[PDB]
A paper describes a structure:
Deoxyribozymes (DNAzymes) are short (15–40 nt) single-stranded DNA molecules that catalyze chemical reactions. DNAzymes generally consist of two substrate binding arms flanking a central catalytic core. The RNA-cleaving 10-23 DNAzyme was the first DNAzyme to be evolved and possesses clinical and biotechnical applications as a biosensor and a knockdown agent. Despite this, a lack of structural and mechanistic information has hindered the optimization and application of the 10-23 DNAzyme.
To address this need, we have obtained a 2.7 Å crystal structure of the 10-23 DNAzyme-substrate complex captured in precatalytic conditions. To combat the crystallization forces contributing to artifact formation, the substrate and DNAzyme were placed on the same continuous ssDNA strand with a snapback GAAA tetraloop to allow for alignment of the scissile phosphate within the DNAzyme catalytic core. This oligonucleotide contains a single ribonucleotide position (−1A), that uses its 2′-OH as the attacking nucleophile to cleave the adjacent 3′ phosphoribose backbone position. To capture a precatalytic 10-23 DNAzyme structure, the 2′-OH position of the RNA nucleophile was modified by 2′-O-methyl (2′-OMe) substitution which was shown to attenuate activity in vitro. The structure exhibits a homodimer conformation with extensive base pairing occurring throughout the 10-23 DNAzyme catalytic core. The dimer is mediated through two regions of antiparallel base pairing within the catalytic core. The region (G2-C7) is palindromic and is responsible for most of the base pair interactions that occur within the dimer. In this structure of the 10-23 DNAzyme, a bend is observed at the scissile phosphate and is coordinated through base pair interaction with the substrate binding arms at the −1 and +1 positions relative to the catalytic core and with G1 forming a non-canonical G-A base pair with the ribo-adenosine at the cleavage site. The captured precatalytic active site conformation does not align the 2′-OH nucleophile with the scissile phosphate in the pre-requisite in-line attack conformation often observed in RNA-cleaving machines. Two magnesium ions are observed to coordinate to the 2′-OH nucleophile, 3′ bridging oxygen, and the 5′ leaving group of the cleavage site.
Author numbering: 0 to 174
The structure:
Amino acid sequence: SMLTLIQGKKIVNHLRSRLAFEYNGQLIKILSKNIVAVGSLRREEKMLNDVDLLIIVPEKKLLKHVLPNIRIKGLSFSVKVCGERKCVLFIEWEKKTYQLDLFTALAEEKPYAIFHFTGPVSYLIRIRAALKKKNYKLNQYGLFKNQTLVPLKITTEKELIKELGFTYRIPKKRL
DNA sequence: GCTGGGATACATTGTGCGCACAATGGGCTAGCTACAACGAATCCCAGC
Ligand SMILES: [Mg+2]
Ligand SMILES: [Mg+2]
Ligand code: NA
Ligand code: NA
Ligand code: NA
Ligand code: NA
Ligand code: NA
Ligand code: NA
Ligand code: NA
Protein backbone atom coordinates (compact mmCIF):
# COMPACT_ATOMS: atom_id res chain seq x y z
CA SER A 1 0.00 0.00 0.00
CA MET A 2 2.73 2.43 1.04
CA LEU A 3 5.15 3.70 -1.60
CA THR A 4 8.24 5.92 -1.77
CA LEU A 5 8.67 9.06 -3.85
CA ILE A 6 10.44 7.44 -6.79
CA GLN A 7 7.86 4.64 -6.81
CA GLY A 8 5.00 7.11 -7.17
CA LYS A 9 7.02 9.07 -9.71
CA LYS A 10 7.28 5.91 -11.79
CA ILE A 11 3.54 5.34 -11.38
CA VAL A 12 2.70 8.85 -12.57
CA ASN A 13 5.10 8.50 -15.50
CA HIS A 14 3.37 5.23 -16.39
CA LEU A 15 -0.14 6.68 -16.06
CA ARG A 16 0.56 9.98 -17.83
CA SER A 17 -0.18 8.32 -21.20
CA ARG A 18 -2.71 5.74 -19.95
CA LEU A 19 -5.57 7.89 -18.60
CA ALA A 20 -8.86 8.08 -20.48
CA PHE A 21 -12.60 8.10 -19.94
CA GLU A 22 -15.71 6.72 -21.64
CA TYR A 23 -17.89 9.58 -22.93
CA ASN A 24 -21.12 8.07 -24.25
CA GLY A 25 -19.29 5.17 -25.86
CA GLN A 26 -16.32 7.24 -27.08
CA LEU A 27 -12.93 6.57 -25.48
CA ILE A 28 -11.35 9.97 -24.82
CA LYS A 29 -7.61 10.17 -23.94
CA ILE A 30 -6.67 12.57 -21.08
CA LEU A 31 -3.61 14.61 -22.29
CA SER A 32 -0.56 14.72 -19.93
CA LYS A 33 -0.65 18.55 -20.01
CA ASN A 34 -3.95 18.19 -18.02
CA ILE A 35 -2.55 15.49 -15.61
CA VAL A 36 -0.80 17.40 -12.77
CA ALA A 37 0.96 15.77 -9.84
CA VAL A 38 -0.38 17.14 -6.56
CA GLY A 39 -0.69 16.31 -2.89
CA SER A 40 2.25 14.85 -1.02
CA LEU A 41 3.79 13.91 -4.38
CA ARG A 42 4.12 17.48 -5.67
CA ARG A 43 5.99 18.04 -2.44
CA GLU A 44 9.16 15.97 -2.63
CA GLU A 45 7.94 13.85 0.29
CA LYS A 46 10.06 10.81 1.15
CA MET A 47 7.06 8.49 1.68
CA LEU A 48 3.60 8.57 0.12
CA ASN A 49 0.32 7.17 1.41
CA ASP A 50 -1.13 7.60 -2.09
CA VAL A 51 -0.66 9.22 -5.49
CA ASP A 52 -2.81 12.31 -6.07
CA LEU A 53 -3.55 13.49 -9.62
CA LEU A 54 -5.39 16.58 -10.87
CA ILE A 55 -7.06 16.26 -14.27
CA ILE A 56 -7.84 19.52 -16.07
CA VAL A 57 -11.14 19.53 -18.03
CA PRO A 58 -11.62 22.25 -20.72
CA GLU A 59 -15.48 22.04 -20.89
CA LYS A 60 -18.08 21.98 -18.07
CA LYS A 61 -20.49 19.23 -19.18
CA LEU A 62 -17.69 16.70 -19.59
CA LEU A 63 -17.03 17.03 -15.86
CA LYS A 64 -19.83 14.51 -15.30
CA HIS A 65 -18.15 11.99 -17.60
CA VAL A 66 -14.44 11.96 -16.67
CA LEU A 67 -14.24 10.33 -13.24
CA PRO A 68 -17.48 8.28 -13.28
CA ASN A 69 -16.28 6.70 -16.55
CA ILE A 70 -12.52 6.93 -15.89
CA ARG A 71 -10.45 4.26 -17.63
CA ILE A 72 -6.84 3.09 -17.39
CA LYS A 73 -5.28 1.01 -20.17
CA GLY A 74 -3.77 -2.24 -18.97
CA LEU A 75 -4.10 -1.64 -15.22
CA SER A 76 -6.20 -3.43 -12.61
CA PHE A 77 -7.98 -1.23 -10.09
CA SER A 78 -10.99 -1.17 -7.79
CA VAL A 79 -13.23 1.84 -7.04
CA LYS A 80 -14.07 2.60 -3.41
CA VAL A 81 -15.92 5.87 -4.10
CA CYS A 82 -16.36 7.88 -7.27
CA GLY A 83 -18.23 11.05 -8.13
CA GLU A 84 -18.00 14.10 -10.35
CA ARG A 85 -15.08 15.76 -8.54
CA LYS A 86 -13.28 13.04 -6.55
CA CYS A 87 -12.42 9.38 -7.10
CA VAL A 88 -10.18 6.94 -5.23
CA LEU A 89 -8.85 3.74 -6.78
CA PHE A 90 -7.09 0.68 -5.38
CA ILE A 91 -4.75 -0.04 -8.29
CA GLU A 92 -2.76 -3.32 -8.50
CA TRP A 93 1.00 -2.64 -9.07
CA GLU A 94 3.36 -5.66 -9.03
CA LYS A 95 1.08 -7.62 -6.60
CA LYS A 96 0.54 -4.65 -4.20
CA THR A 97 -2.65 -2.54 -3.95
CA TYR A 98 -2.00 1.21 -4.07
CA GLN A 99 -4.24 4.20 -3.41
CA LEU A 100 -4.60 6.54 -6.40
CA ASP A 101 -6.79 9.64 -6.10
CA LEU A 102 -8.15 11.62 -9.06
CA PHE A 103 -9.55 15.14 -8.74
CA THR A 104 -10.98 17.28 -11.54
CA ALA A 105 -10.55 21.04 -12.08
CA LEU A 106 -11.83 23.28 -14.91
CA ALA A 107 -9.07 25.24 -16.76
CA GLU A 108 -10.44 28.57 -15.47
CA GLU A 109 -9.77 27.32 -11.92
CA LYS A 110 -6.42 25.62 -12.62
CA PRO A 111 -4.25 27.79 -10.30
CA TYR A 112 -6.76 27.50 -7.46
CA ALA A 113 -7.32 23.75 -7.62
CA ILE A 114 -3.57 23.10 -8.10
CA PHE A 115 -2.91 25.34 -5.02
CA HIS A 116 -5.53 23.50 -2.94
CA PHE A 117 -4.21 20.09 -3.94
CA THR A 118 -0.46 20.89 -3.68
CA GLY A 119 0.27 22.35 -0.20
CA PRO A 120 -0.10 20.38 3.07
CA VAL A 121 -3.41 20.46 4.90
CA SER A 122 -2.04 22.63 7.72
CA TYR A 123 -0.60 25.22 5.33
CA LEU A 124 -3.98 25.42 3.62
CA ILE A 125 -5.81 25.85 6.92
CA ARG A 126 -3.55 28.74 7.91
CA ILE A 127 -3.94 30.45 4.54
CA ARG A 128 -7.73 30.13 4.44
CA ALA A 129 -8.01 31.46 8.00
CA ALA A 130 -5.93 34.51 7.09
CA LEU A 131 -8.10 35.16 4.03
CA LYS A 132 -11.35 34.59 5.93
CA LYS A 133 -10.33 37.24 8.44
CA LYS A 134 -10.66 39.79 5.60
CA ASN A 135 -14.08 38.46 4.55
CA TYR A 136 -12.79 36.14 1.84
CA LYS A 137 -13.36 32.49 0.95
CA LEU A 138 -10.67 30.59 -0.96
CA ASN A 139 -11.20 27.05 -2.24
CA GLN A 140 -10.43 24.97 -5.33
CA TYR A 141 -12.85 27.02 -7.46
CA GLY A 142 -11.85 30.64 -6.84
CA LEU A 143 -11.66 33.53 -4.42
CA PHE A 144 -15.00 34.61 -2.94
CA LYS A 145 -16.11 37.68 -0.98
CA ASN A 146 -19.67 38.08 0.36
CA GLN A 147 -20.73 34.95 -1.53
CA THR A 148 -19.42 36.39 -4.79
CA LEU A 149 -16.47 35.30 -6.91
CA VAL A 150 -13.64 37.85 -6.84
CA PRO A 151 -11.86 38.00 -10.23
CA LEU A 152 -8.03 38.10 -10.08
CA LYS A 153 -5.53 39.01 -12.87
CA ILE A 154 -3.71 35.69 -12.57
CA THR A 155 -2.98 32.60 -14.64
CA THR A 156 -0.50 30.40 -12.69
CA GLU A 157 -0.27 29.20 -9.11
CA LYS A 158 2.62 31.60 -8.42
CA GLU A 159 0.77 34.62 -9.81
CA LEU A 160 -2.14 33.59 -7.61
CA ILE A 161 0.20 33.34 -4.62
CA LYS A 162 1.47 36.93 -4.81
CA GLU A 163 -1.83 38.50 -6.04
CA LEU A 164 -3.26 37.07 -2.77
CA GLY A 165 -0.58 38.68 -0.57
CA PHE A 166 1.37 35.74 0.91
CA THR A 167 5.04 34.97 0.37
CA TYR A 168 5.64 32.36 -2.32
CA ARG A 169 7.03 29.01 -1.19
CA ILE A 170 8.05 26.19 -3.54
CA PRO A 171 5.88 23.14 -2.79
CA LYS A 172 8.63 21.43 -0.79
CA LYS A 173 9.04 24.01 1.98
CA ARG A 174 5.31 24.70 2.41
CA LEU A 175 4.30 23.71 5.94
C1' DG B 1 -10.60 25.80 6.24
C1' DC B 2 -13.26 24.13 2.83
C1' DT B 3 -15.26 20.61 0.14
C1' DG B 4 -16.82 15.62 -1.93
C1' DG B 5 -19.19 10.97 -1.81
C1' DG B 6 -22.38 7.74 0.19
C1' DA B 7 -26.29 6.35 2.91
C1' DT B 8 -30.35 8.22 5.71
C1' DA B 9 -34.23 4.75 12.70
C1' DC B 10 -34.09 0.59 15.88
C1' DA B 11 -32.05 -4.18 17.16
C1' DT B 12 -28.99 -8.68 15.43
C1' DT B 13 -24.54 -11.07 12.31
C1' DG B 14 -19.38 -12.27 9.89
C1' DT B 15 -14.33 -10.74 10.37
C1' DG B 16 -9.31 -11.67 9.66
C1' DC B 17 -7.36 -9.92 13.12
C1' DG B 18 -13.15 -7.37 22.12
C1' DC B 19 -13.28 -6.03 17.14
C1' DA B 20 -15.90 -2.66 12.84
C1' DC B 21 -19.84 -2.11 8.18
C1' DA B 22 -23.11 -4.47 4.91
C1' DA B 23 -26.81 -7.24 5.54
C1' DT B 24 -31.39 -9.25 8.20
C1' DG B 25 -35.51 -8.93 11.28
C1' DG B 26 -39.66 -7.03 13.82
C1' DG B 27 -42.72 -4.30 16.53
C1' DC B 28 -44.68 0.38 15.50
C1' DT B 29 -47.50 3.39 12.90
C1' DA B 30 -49.62 6.34 9.12
C1' DG B 31 -53.12 5.92 5.99
C1' DC B 32 -55.67 3.75 2.91
C1' DT B 33 -55.73 4.26 -6.28
C1' DA B 34 -55.04 -2.42 -0.94
C1' DC B 35 -50.26 2.88 -5.70
C1' DA B 36 -46.46 4.92 -4.81
C1' DA B 37 -43.82 9.34 -5.61
C1' DC B 38 -38.36 15.10 -5.21
C1' DG B 39 -34.84 16.20 -3.36
C1' DA B 40 -32.80 19.42 0.07
C1' DA B 41 -31.12 18.55 4.88
C1' DT B 42 -28.09 15.76 7.68
C1' DC B 43 -24.26 13.12 9.13
C1' DC B 44 -19.95 10.47 8.72
C1' DC B 45 -16.46 9.30 6.54
C1' DA B 46 -12.95 11.07 2.94
C1' DG B 47 -9.27 14.85 0.14
C1' DC B 48 -5.94 18.53 0.21
MG1 LIG C 1 -2.32 11.88 -1.34
MG1 LIG D 1 -29.96 5.24 14.09
NA1 NA E 1 -15.49 14.51 -13.42
NA1 NA F 1 -11.40 20.38 -8.05
NA1 NA G 1 -17.41 35.99 -0.37
NA1 NA H 1 -12.84 43.12 -4.83
NA1 NA I 1 3.72 31.82 2.27
NA1 NA J 1 -55.01 2.35 -1.65
NA1 NA K 1 -55.71 -0.34 -7.65
